[PDB]
Write a protein that binds this ligand. Sequence first.
Ligand SMILES: *[C@@H]1O[C@H](CO[C@@H]2O[C@@H](C)[C@@H](O)[C@@H](O)[C@@H]2O)[C@@H](O[C@@H]2O[C@H](CO)[C@@H](O[C@@H]3O[C@H](CO[C@H]4O[C@H](CO)[C@@H](O)[C@H](O)[C@@H]4O)[C@@H](O)[C@H](O[C@H]4O[C@H](CO)[C@@H](O)[C@H](O)[C@@H]4O)[C@@H]3O)[C@H](O)[C@H]2NC(C)=O)[C@H](O)[C@H]1NC(C)=O
Ligand SMILES: *[C@@H]1O[C@H](CO)[C@@H](O[C@@H]2O[C@H](CO)[C@@H](O[C@@H]3O[C@H](CO[C@H]4O[C@H](CO)[C@@H](O)[C@H](O)[C@@H]4O)[C@@H](O)[C@H](O[C@H]4O[C@H](CO)[C@@H](O)[C@H](O)[C@@H]4O)[C@@H]3O)[C@H](O)[C@H]2NC(C)=O)[C@H](O)[C@H]1NC(C)=O
Ligand SMILES: *[C@@H]1O[C@H](CO)[C@@H](O[C@@H]2O[C@H](CO)[C@@H](O[C@@H]3O[C@H](CO[C@H]4O[C@H](CO)[C@@H](O)[C@H](O)[C@@H]4O)[C@@H](O)[C@H](O[C@H]4O[C@H](CO)[C@@H](O)[C@H](O)[C@@H]4O)[C@@H]3O)[C@H](O)[C@H]2NC(C)=O)[C@H](O)[C@H]1NC(C)=O
Ligand SMILES: *[C@@H]1O[C@H](CO)[C@@H](O[C@@H]2O[C@H](CO)[C@@H](O[C@@H]3O[C@H](CO[C@H]4O[C@H](CO)[C@@H](O)[C@H](O)[C@@H]4O)[C@@H](O)[C@H](O[C@H]4O[C@H](CO)[C@@H](O)[C@H](O)[C@@H]4O)[C@@H]3O)[C@H](O)[C@H]2NC(C)=O)[C@H](O)[C@H]1NC(C)=O
Ligand SMILES: *[C@@H]1O[C@H](CO[C@@H]2O[C@@H](C)[C@@H](O)[C@@H](O)[C@@H]2O)[C@@H](O[C@@H]2O[C@H](CO)[C@@H](O[C@@H]3O[C@H](CO)[C@@H](O)[C@H](O)[C@@H]3O)[C@H](O)[C@H]2NC(C)=O)[C@H](O)[C@H]1NC(C)=O
Ligand SMILES: *[C@@H]1O[C@H](CO)[C@@H](O[C@@H]2O[C@H](CO)[C@@H](O[C@@H]3O[C@H](CO)[C@@H](O)[C@H](O)[C@@H]3O)[C@H](O)[C@H]2NC(C)=O)[C@H](O)[C@H]1NC(C)=O
Ligand SMILES: *[C@@H]1O[C@H](CO)[C@@H](O[C@@H]2O[C@H](CO)[C@@H](O)[C@H](O)[C@H]2NC(C)=O)[C@H](O)[C@H]1NC(C)=O
Ligand SMILES: *[C@@H]1O[C@H](COC2O[C@@H](C)[C@@H](O)[C@@H](O)[C@@H]2O)[C@@H](O)[C@H](O)[C@H]1NC(C)=O
Ligand SMILES: *[C@@H]1O[C@H](CO[C@H]2O[C@H](C)[C@@H](O)[C@@H](O)[C@@H]2O)[C@@H](O)[C@H](O)[C@H]1NC(C)=O
Ligand SMILES: *[C@@H]1O[C@H](CO)[C@@H](O)[C@H](O)[C@H]1NC(C)=O
Ligand SMILES: *[C@@H]1O[C@H](CO)[C@@H](O)[C@H](O)[C@H]1NC(C)=O
Ligand SMILES: *[C@@H]1O[C@H](CO)[C@@H](O)[C@H](O)[C@H]1NC(C)=O
Ligand SMILES: *[C@@H]1O[C@H](CO)[C@@H](O)[C@H](O)[C@H]1NC(C)=O
Ligand SMILES: *[C@@H]1O[C@H](CO)[C@@H](O)[C@H](O)[C@H]1NC(C)=O
Ligand SMILES: *[C@@H]1O[C@H](CO)[C@@H](O)[C@H](O)[C@H]1NC(C)=O
Lengths: 172, 172, 171, 320, 323, 323
Amino acid sequence: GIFGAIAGFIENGWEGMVDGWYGFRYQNSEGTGQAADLKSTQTAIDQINEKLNRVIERTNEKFHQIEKEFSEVEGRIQDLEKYVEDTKIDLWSYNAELLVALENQHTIDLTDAEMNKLFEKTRRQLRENAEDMGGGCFKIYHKCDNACIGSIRNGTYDHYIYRDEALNNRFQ
Amino acid sequence: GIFGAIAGFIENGWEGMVDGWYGFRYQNSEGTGQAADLKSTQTAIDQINEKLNRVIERTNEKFHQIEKEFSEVEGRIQDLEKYVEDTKIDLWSYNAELLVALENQHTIDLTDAEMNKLFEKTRRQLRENAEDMGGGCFKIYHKCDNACIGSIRNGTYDHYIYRDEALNNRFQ
Amino acid sequence: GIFGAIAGFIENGWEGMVDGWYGFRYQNSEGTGQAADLKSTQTAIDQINEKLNRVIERTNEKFHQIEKEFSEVEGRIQDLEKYVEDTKIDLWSYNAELLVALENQHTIDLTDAEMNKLFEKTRRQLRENAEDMGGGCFKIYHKCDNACIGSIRNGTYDHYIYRDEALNNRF
Amino acid sequence: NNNTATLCLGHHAVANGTLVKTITDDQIEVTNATELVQSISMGKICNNSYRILDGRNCTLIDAMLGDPHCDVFQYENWDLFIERSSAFSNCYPYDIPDYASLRSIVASSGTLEFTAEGFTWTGVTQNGRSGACKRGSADSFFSRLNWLTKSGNSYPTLNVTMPNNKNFDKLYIWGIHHPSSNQEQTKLYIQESGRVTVSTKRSQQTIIPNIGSRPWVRGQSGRISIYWTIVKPGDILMINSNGNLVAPRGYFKLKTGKSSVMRSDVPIDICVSECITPNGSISNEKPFQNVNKVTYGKCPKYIRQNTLKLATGMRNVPEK
Amino acid sequence: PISNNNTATLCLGHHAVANGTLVKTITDDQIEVTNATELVQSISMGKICNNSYRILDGRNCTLIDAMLGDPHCDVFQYENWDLFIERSSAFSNCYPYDIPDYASLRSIVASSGTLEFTAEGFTWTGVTQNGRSGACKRGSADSFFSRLNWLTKSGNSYPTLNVTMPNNKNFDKLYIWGIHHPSSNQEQTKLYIQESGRVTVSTKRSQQTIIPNIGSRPWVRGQSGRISIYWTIVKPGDILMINSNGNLVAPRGYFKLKTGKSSVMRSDVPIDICVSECITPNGSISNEKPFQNVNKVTYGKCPKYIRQNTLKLATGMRNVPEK
Amino acid sequence: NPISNNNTATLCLGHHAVANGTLVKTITDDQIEVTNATELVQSISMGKICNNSYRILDGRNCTLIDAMLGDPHCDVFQYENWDLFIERSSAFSNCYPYDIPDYASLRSIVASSGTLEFTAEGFTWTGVTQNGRSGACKRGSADSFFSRLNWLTKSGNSYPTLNVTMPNNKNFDKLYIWGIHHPSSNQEQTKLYIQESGRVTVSTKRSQQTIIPNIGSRPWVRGQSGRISIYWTIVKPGDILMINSNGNLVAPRGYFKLKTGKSSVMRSDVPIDICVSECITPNGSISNEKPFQNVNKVTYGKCPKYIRQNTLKLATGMRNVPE
Ligand SMILES: *[C@@H]1O[C@H](CO[C@@H]2O[C@@H](C)[C@@H](O)[C@@H](O)[C@@H]2O)[C@@H](O[C@@H]2O[C@H](CO)[C@@H](O[C@@H]3O[C@H](CO[C@H]4O[C@H](CO)[C@@H](O)[C@H](O)[C@@H]4O)[C@@H](O)[C@H](O[C@H]4O[C@H](CO)[C@@H](O)[C@H](O)[C@@H]4O)[C@@H]3O)[C@H](O)[C@H]2NC(C)=O)[C@H](O)[C@H]1NC(C)=O
Ligand SMILES: *[C@@H]1O[C@H](CO)[C@@H](O[C@@H]2O[C@H](CO)[C@@H](O[C@@H]3O[C@H](CO[C@H]4O[C@H](CO)[C@@H](O)[C@H](O)[C@@H]4O)[C@@H](O)[C@H](O[C@H]4O[C@H](CO)[C@@H](O)[C@H](O)[C@@H]4O)[C@@H]3O)[C@H](O)[C@H]2NC(C)=O)[C@H](O)[C@H]1NC(C)=O
Ligand SMILES: *[C@@H]1O[C@H](CO)[C@@H](O[C@@H]2O[C@H](CO)[C@@H](O[C@@H]3O[C@H](CO[C@H]4O[C@H](CO)[C@@H](O)[C@H](O)[C@@H]4O)[C@@H](O)[C@H](O[C@H]4O[C@H](CO)[C@@H](O)[C@H](O)[C@@H]4O)[C@@H]3O)[C@H](O)[C@H]2NC(C)=O)[C@H](O)[C@H]1NC(C)=O
Ligand SMILES: *[C@@H]1O[C@H](CO)[C@@H](O[C@@H]2O[C@H](CO)[C@@H](O[C@@H]3O[C@H](CO[C@H]4O[C@H](CO)[C@@H](O)[C@H](O)[C@@H]4O)[C@@H](O)[C@H](O[C@H]4O[C@H](CO)[C@@H](O)[C@H](O)[C@@H]4O)[C@@H]3O)[C@H](O)[C@H]2NC(C)=O)[C@H](O)[C@H]1NC(C)=O
Ligand SMILES: *[C@@H]1O[C@H](CO[C@@H]2O[C@@H](C)[C@@H](O)[C@@H](O)[C@@H]2O)[C@@H](O[C@@H]2O[C@H](CO)[C@@H](O[C@@H]3O[C@H](CO)[C@@H](O)[C@H](O)[C@@H]3O)[C@H](O)[C@H]2NC(C)=O)[C@H](O)[C@H]1NC(C)=O
Ligand SMILES: *[C@@H]1O[C@H](CO)[C@@H](O[C@@H]2O[C@H](CO)[C@@H](O[C@@H]3O[C@H](CO)[C@@H](O)[C@H](O)[C@@H]3O)[C@H](O)[C@H]2NC(C)=O)[C@H](O)[C@H]1NC(C)=O
Ligand SMILES: *[C@@H]1O[C@H](CO)[C@@H](O[C@@H]2O[C@H](CO)[C@@H](O)[C@H](O)[C@H]2NC(C)=O)[C@H](O)[C@H]1NC(C)=O
Ligand SMILES: *[C@@H]1O[C@H](COC2O[C@@H](C)[C@@H](O)[C@@H](O)[C@@H]2O)[C@@H](O)[C@H](O)[C@H]1NC(C)=O
Ligand SMILES: *[C@@H]1O[C@H](CO[C@H]2O[C@H](C)[C@@H](O)[C@@H](O)[C@@H]2O)[C@@H](O)[C@H](O)[C@H]1NC(C)=O
Ligand SMILES: *[C@@H]1O[C@H](CO)[C@@H](O)[C@H](O)[C@H]1NC(C)=O
Ligand SMILES: *[C@@H]1O[C@H](CO)[C@@H](O)[C@H](O)[C@H]1NC(C)=O
Ligand SMILES: *[C@@H]1O[C@H](CO)[C@@H](O)[C@H](O)[C@H]1NC(C)=O
Ligand SMILES: *[C@@H]1O[C@H](CO)[C@@H](O)[C@H](O)[C@H]1NC(C)=O
Ligand SMILES: *[C@@H]1O[C@H](CO)[C@@H](O)[C@H](O)[C@H]1NC(C)=O
Ligand SMILES: *[C@@H]1O[C@H](CO)[C@@H](O)[C@H](O)[C@H]1NC(C)=O
């Protein structure tokens, strides 16, 4: 993916994450833990369902048309009738091929996007209290009980509380 | 967007910003201010006009074609005339539907990029004299009058002269 | 491109990099040097190869078709035979124009992406031992012989080993 | 360590992913995908969405004409007429110039509503019959056609009129008889050669007969050629003939129709499906199908690929 | 609470508008952007503009009656068009006729774009020319199609006509001719002597024989008989030949054929002085946008007909209001 | 500090570039330089047709139709077959003048079949002279006729109602070619067939075609004011041909076998030559390495799709940004 998150700087997925497409694994003084991030999951799901809404149960009424099989040999007219259908199919086949390749290319991209967005949403939250260790993991340089992880998860973490403790374990 | 800047880590647009599409708001010892960034605004606008030039006033000459309304019932030759037309229209409709949905998806993604790119351009300029607050805002840890803001905006900010000051204000 | 690396914060290309698409230049105690990054070069070439393979020698057999030039005026049937061909040609010409413009966009943007991904992978390895100077260059705040540079390039650079030394030189 | 924590971000994966095609990748594994190509029929033609008519051993034309074994179809109407391949004609041998166009016009209109009309055929014997066209175990003829012959030693010029005072197009099916010998031409029709001129204000079709032997079919070395004439509101039908006329008995009603005709040999049955093909009905959940290019109703589009997997999840990168 | 003088705050951002507009993308069915632009043209001018392409109003005449020389269509002699307009009020007022493959002839002429007709001295030896009929009133007398010559007997006979006309030009000539079908046997022998006519029209490569067909047809403007019109196209270097011994409605000359960009359209909207390069039956339309929903039948520089009536292309970023 | 420090280093990241880039078109730009690109439109034929991949047949001075009928100068084409038959524009007929209703369809059927494999049959012609000949159709030093047609004429002073039959016991569709002769005058008609007017009726169980002659002058072609008209009948496995004439029949000598081929015909004047290509046009063979082509809409083989554009460069590299 163009953002290098999935199949990239995050090494693999978690089969263990049953309840979300994206989420957290963490370790602190209380043990370790795992939580799903619902908002990113929903953005990626809604996006895919919208592609889906645009193709499934979206067929079109067509009634009497032209004949496409022929028991007799006729020549000029039948040549035309056959060429018309041949041409049509080739053009829809082309279309369908392209549609799926593009949509899939795009589904891979926007799911890489949501991974990246979350990783940035979390980094921006941690300010100077944390470093990117690589692998999609942050080393948080301060005591962080689960309720604190909870505050990071639910977007309420306040870096000014731990900034002094953090800058001090980080440097110097 | 895929970058998560517009309708993402930036809360919202500025209705008060009428002289440009992207830009800066700022606050210092001299007060509050707002100036647009012309280079990005031009980039977004150039890309959109290039789409637009591709489709407005670019139509094909066609002259004598086939009959498409019929007053009499004929069967086989009429069936084929109607079928060919129906086939043509269904296929042009598909192209149109798909083209607009692509262009739009692109337009949204590339204006997000220009926004994110302006952010990144400014982060590099500022080096270790500033910190991403979140919200698309930087906290700059040194005396930064309008002349100094001006510098960032026209790409002439030299981080080196403020560095000693700035390191000091943020890690002490 | 959308990542702003190529034709952006990377000011220009290197005509001297003759064995890679992406890579590194460095200057240290031991001197100056250039090395390609293969993983990044290959990813980019592979993806372009798949675009290419999807459109070359994929032509489809066609045999007896309808007639497309005429030496007599005939009216209705010829009108229809000609309309079907002009209709068919216009549609493929559009397919062709759109296919090339989309791919080309995507190729520009995916080559931009690998340049950024190389940059980010590098940033992440160096942790606190280096600052981004702009231009795609890092200032590495410690002694860094050719062996050490290689360690960065083969993804094995360990930053704790030099952290104290570098934190010193930055503050 | 008690004064540091670790927070890792990630995404899910599955034991069993599925391969899809993208622009840059021929194959690549995602957590989930969905099939956009319908390649499986139901085996049968479903009859509960649209009104389907099993033609059995009758073609749509033979039903229209009134072949005796096609009588159960008098006045039938359909959304889709299904022609079986084992269909056969079992009446007097005939040929129809531009057969496909009539079949199409009948298929299209969707009905065999026939209204008889009070034709006066002064000075001829009507309801001519034949061993080729048994009904009961009695010689007979196409039920919608009136085969006229001499009365005594005359077949006077027939000049009849019939106006369309309706607000729909009338369709008339008539014919000309081509006899096998001059010995027969004269015996049946008196005159040495027929003429049949079916005309309106706008159109006219003369047909001359053509005596001579054709291949033997159900006792007959002769033939009947079938023609049709449409009559629009306000217009008027005129028939002029001094021999060989296989006359009309009435008109068929022509409707702007959604109807059609299909050739299949699969069993009709009770299910529900709004897409019909010669292989049977197919589901229409998916946008495309690879079952048959011949379709009727709400149908996925025919294409040459049998599989197209659309990714409905992220890229799958398993663990260990 | 008071910004330290050795700090400053710098925020980046983008604009937004009051009047956002909804557009469709890949990921979103509807989404608000700062600006859009309609790419589907669903509105016509309700008239046809004459100032670009040469438009010709057929009025009461069809192109075919204009070509044959129906009396009330005399004003259309030598005319030419980029676009011939046929009205639904258009009627015929001559001898009743039919045209096998009418459609094709109409196309062929409409395509050529002209009724430039040149008379040729055909020599009809042993026959009376310029047959006329009360069914075809010119002014206040019996007349006929001006571009056709109805031949009949002279005295006791109608000899076997055998006339030839070489095409020494460098353009394809079109000859319109016909055959009269009498109402009765008496009318046949009265007019032509031979009890059944024959018309063989030939070139070095083609030929067409039509035998007449006698019998009553519906009364139309006095007539129970009919005329059937056929055409023939003689190519440069070739040579027309006509061999009849009854029932021939003769040609008086040829029509110049031209490969050209001209046509014919059925509409009943008025024609007016304006400018437009695209015409439909609903009227002229603007060709600024690339697609249109007004009509499938078009002529000139036209947007492509599609089924959708609106497609908004975004001309601006995602709109995100304050508050 | 001019001399760099021993205790720092500089690591710069970049991409390559070339002195000589090339321009391509994108969504955001009409033109933008990339390190390289591949042209996707073939607009250069080889200037000749290649005869090694597909079986090509030079028709030389002959049409496919003449070759089928057995026009003397086309006798080399007997029992031939082809993937692609090439017709030259300088090809002429040199035998009795004829015309073929729906010539186009017969040409297309035969081309499609891909063979002039003719098998003769025992048509017992009772009571007539066979193998008629004409000064219009020299074979060697002598008057003759199409090799596949038996021109029948009277025996003494009688031409009886011929009634011959011929079943199809094979498992393929037989194609029978036949005709009727149109004389110039009644004098000739009776000289040749006794009956003042003839008639031909060819029939199967399911189909029939009756043709009547039309005596009269046509334009003089190679010594003739008369014409032959060619018709065909296709007979299905199980069916049965029946021929019934009392005058003017130009009889079939047998049948042509029809195949479900991948065969065709193509008009072209370029020379045929040794080389290997699987895509052919009137301009010559083209390479099919590329997906599209601008050479011709007439093609045969494994062909790139005809488009209107002459170049479409596809980017095979990143954006080029020189040093
Ligand atoms: C995810 O797992 C899928 C599960 O498959 C299995 O079922 C589970 C419970 C375990 O038992 C596991 O061990 C099994 O393998 C797996 O699905 C499958 O993927 C393979 C391709 O890797 C499919 O192979 C193709 O099979 C068809 C025939 O399929 C029918 O018959 C077999 C009889 O054994 C049954 O599987 C079904 O009844 C099928 O209806 C072959 O004709 C086809 O051959 C073509 O392709 C190969 C190369 O790919 C060529 O060699 C051949 O010449 C042909 O051109 C394939 O071999 C397999 O059918 C399919 N299984 C099922 C049950 O659907 C899937 O691969 C896993 N996904 C990933 C991403 O790993
Ligand atoms: C892999 O990706 C596929 C995408 O194709 C996912 O499959 C879809 O899953 C969702 C949710 O499970 C399905 O949504 C449901 O649609 C029902 C309507 O029927 C559809 O699906 C059937 C297939 O059996 C078709 O026959 C039919 O034409 C329709 O397309 C709705 O009825 C459901 O609504 C409600 O139903 C019940 C009762 O009210 C509630 O309990 C539900 O919560 C729900 O509100 C429902 O919306 C969708 O139809 C599936 N598509 C297909 C093609 O099967 C898979 O989920 C995904 N797999 C994994 C493992 O993630
Ligand atoms: C074969 O069969 C057809 C049908 O039976 C015959 O055709 C009819 O021919 C008669 C005349 O022979 C036609 O009658 C003419 O109608 C004209 C007006 O028609 C309209 O208006 C009247 C109102 O009165 C309506 O009734 C009619 O339906 C039409 O809507 C009149 O103008 C004609 O009158 C003539 O005679 C007298 C003077 O002698 C005067 O009234 C006039 O001056 C005029 O000269 C006449 O009445 C009739 O329309 C035809 N019918 C059809 C359906 O075409 C064939 O004659 C017949 N032929 C043979 C050989 O058998
Ligand atoms: C219906 O009307 C047509 C046209 O009037 C008649 O057809 C013409 O019939 C004549 C009589 O046979 C044809 O004459 C022959 O035509 C050939 C024409 O080709 C060349 O010759 C001319 C004349 O010298 C050159 O000027 C010109 O460049 C041509 O290239 C000639 O080849 C014939 O030449 C000679 O034939 C013999 C000797 O071999 C002798 O009679 C003379 O020496 C003669 O010159 C000959 O002239 C003429 O071609 C026909 N024209 C057309 C268009 O077909 C029909 O016969 C007529 N039918 C009836 C029933 O009257
Ligand atoms: C914080 O900053 C404010 C804002 O003023 C300015 O920003 C600073 C970084 C300085 O570089 C200023 O030069 C710049 O304009 C300071 O308020 C301002 O202080 C200056 C210095 O005393 C005042 O200028 C003087 O004003 C007096 C009395 O009017 C005159 O006698 C002098 O001639 C001269 O003009 C200025 O008036 C004053 N402005 C206001 C609104 O109070 C502020 O002192 C500073 N405070 C701290 C603690 O850093
Ligand atoms: C012209 O020639 C054909 C072929 O010789 C003749 O057709 C044949 O006519 C005979 C005479 O009645 C037919 O006899 C019938 O044969 C069938 C065979 O199944 C049989 O079931 C009947 O009881 C009857 O005997 C024969 O079928 C028929 N064959 C064909 C192909 O038509 C024709 O009669 C000749 N015409 C003239 C005027 O001589
Ligand atoms: C750059 O691209 C061109 C073509 O897209 C490559 O050169 C062509 O190679 C192919 C066969 O490999 C043929 O079209 C011609 O033989 C070559 N083109 C010309 C103009 O001679 C070229 O090798 C690519 N790579 C580079 C230059 O590094
Ligand atoms: C990776 O690099 C380490 C740094 O030393 C060197 O760099 C590479 C590119 C070679 O050129 C060496 O000869 C240099 O000394 C190595 O010490 C280390 O072994 C390497 N490890 C792996 C797994 O490649
Ligand atoms: C955000 O989290 C804060 C603290 O983290 C906790 O969150 C979950 C829900 C609890 O069950 C405990 O694990 C922690 O106390 C909360 O104080 C705060 O109220 C939360 N706010 C919102 C809007 O979710
Ligand atoms: C940038 O802006 C400063 C202050 O606003 C101004 O003095 C100067 O002209 C600009 N400098 C350059 C190098 O463009
Ligand atoms: C469906 O039936 C057709 C015959 O109409 C057959 O050729 C085809 O292979 C079948 N295809 C299916 C079931 O996909
Ligand atoms: C927005 O688009 C409109 C309509 O497409 C166009 O006329 C105008 O130039 C644009 N106006 C603004 C304010 O962006
Ligand atoms: C058409 O004909 C009628 C009656 O002859 C006449 O009054 C009218 O003016 C004509 N209409 C036009 C548009 O010329
Ligand atoms: C729009 O075009 C259609 C088709 O020709 C027509 O039926 C409709 O009335 C038109 N609208 C007008 C003339 O206002
Ligand atoms: C190729 O041949 C065609 C004949 O079909 C001719 O009209 C055209 O001018 C030629 N075009 C080329 C060589 O591109």
